[PDB]
Design a protein around this ligand. Structure first.
Ligand code: HEM
Ligand SMILES: C=C[C@H](c1ccc(-c2ccc(O)c(Cl)c2)cc1)n1ccnc1
Length: 391
């Protein structure tokens, strides 16, 4: 039985995806746990699954369910956004993580420029993942959360385990989770934390309108939004920089006309291979998806690059075109009930990071042949362990 995932490489889509999409856009596969699942790979069927709440994220955590991979958080945290919504916290969380917070964008620009100046001083080769994209993501999320910048690196170092895609429970994930929760709980008790997401959660925790909300949920919001935001923005920016480096004509165009960078980033989102696995959902009813009657209790995997390279929806899907008529209609941020709450922040992180890099390093190029990149395995993102560049 066809095994998923197909390839940990984030620099090229396997030819097999287009064949599946054409012939079998919903197809039985085996996951790393040995479970069977339905892999959905067309824009039409991916959108159908993501927009039908009977394909449940929450129920993927149920004991005894077929699993894509092992939990790395407590099972109730899989329903984190539902818990946030039920607690009356959605609006406050969203307001806290907007890129338009006063001074946030300038902080992003200043941080990016400082990171780049240090790389220039040290001399090529430079590692754009470990010494640019990931520190930029980490610094951004410390600022957004309102926590000390110097605490970023230790929180960041949880994530190479936190976002593993493992067949089995990971003992280090429990250690790191418990430690990171204790940290966020202490932050909520720290009177000096008055800004950002944790400053606002700290205030709401003392507000009688929220007296019922548990300390557990407040700390969980901090751990989950830091982890999801840092891994997603650092990994997306890293692999978008590869796509851009691979396209010198586009790199030069965006350097010459940086007002096109938002359109460029939107296409880089569309062609991004950062998510290593399909998005998992558990059927809570018998539901017809294409030619397959998915049965209650079965696992469905929504393959984002299946949708995003679907030529019916995005003609010439492998080409970056800055004037498509349907440019934000990709699924890079998901779709439906679980659409990424951080989407605007993720866009802005990448836009500013790329703007800064192109100004400082207009000649940026890989310093090794592209096949020498080392792609992280058994992880929820596809990323190169190092991204060596020259300029
Ligand atoms: C370019 C950057 C990002 C990408 C590509 C991305 C991608 C995604 C995708 C595809 C989903 C849907 C998962 C699903 O439906 O199963 C998602 C959800 C989520 N994202 Fe993002 N994300 C990014 C940035 C962020 C940021 C900056 C934050 C927070 C600061 C964040 C926090 C979350 C959370 C908490 C969820 C879960 C939502 C829910 O369960 O309803 N993400 N993200
Ligand atoms: C399913 C939840 C997933 C998520 C997974 C793992 C973590 C995590 C963070 C720090 C840790 O120390 C450990 Cl061990 C785990 C956080 C979040 N997620 C993705 C978007 N929203 C939530």
């Amino acid at each position: 039985l066809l095994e998923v995932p197909f390839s940990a490489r984030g620099d090229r889509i396997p030819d097999a995806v287009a064949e599946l999409r054409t012939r079998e856009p919903i197809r039985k596969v085996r996951t790393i746990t040995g479970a069977e699942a339905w892999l959905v790979s067309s824009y039409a069927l991916c959108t159908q699954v993501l927009e039908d709440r009977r394909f449940s994220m929450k129920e993927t955590a149920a004991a005894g369910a077929p699993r894509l991979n092992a939990l790395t958080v407590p099972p109730e945290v899989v329903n984190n956004m539902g818990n946030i919504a039920d607690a009356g916290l959605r609006k406050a969380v969203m307001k806290a993580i907007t890129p338009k917070a006063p001074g946030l964008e300038q902080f992003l620009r200043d941080t990016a420029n400082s990171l780049l100046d240090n790389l220039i001083t040290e001399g090529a080769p430079a590692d754009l993942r470990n010494d640019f994209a990931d520190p930029l993501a980490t610094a951004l999320h410390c600022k957004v959360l309102g926590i000390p910048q110097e605490d970023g690196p230790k929180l960041f170092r949880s994530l190479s385990i936190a976002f593993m895609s493992s067949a089995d429970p990971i003992p280090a994930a429990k250690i790191n989770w418990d430690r990171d929760i204790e940290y966020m709980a202490g932050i909520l008790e720290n009177p000096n934390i008055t800004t950002g997401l944790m400053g606002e959660l700290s205030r709401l925790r003392k507000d009688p309108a929220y007296s019922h909300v548990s300390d557990e949920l407040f700390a969980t919001i901090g751990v989950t939004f830091f982890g999801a935001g840092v891994i997603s923005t650092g990994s997306f920016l890293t692999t978008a920089l590869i796509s851009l480096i691979q396209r010198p004509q586009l790199r030069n165009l965006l350097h010459e006309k940086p007002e096109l960078i938002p359109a460029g980033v939107e296409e880089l989102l569309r062609i991004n291979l950062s998510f290593a696995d399909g998005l998992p959902r558990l059927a809570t009813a018998d539901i017809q998806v294409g030619d397959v009657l998915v049965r209650k209790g079965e696992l469905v995997l929504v393959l984002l690059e299946g949708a995003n390279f679907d030529p019916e929806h995005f003609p010439n899907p492998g080409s970056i075109e800055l004037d498509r008529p349907n440019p934000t209609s990709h699924l890079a941020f998901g779709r439906g009930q679980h659409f990424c709450p951080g989407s605007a922040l993720g866009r802005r992180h990448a836009q500013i990071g790329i703007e800064a890099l192109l100004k400082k390093m207009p000649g940026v190029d890989l310093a090794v042949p592209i096949d020498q990149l080392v792609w992280r395995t058994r992880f929820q993102r596809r990323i190169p362990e190092r991204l060596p560049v020259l300029w």
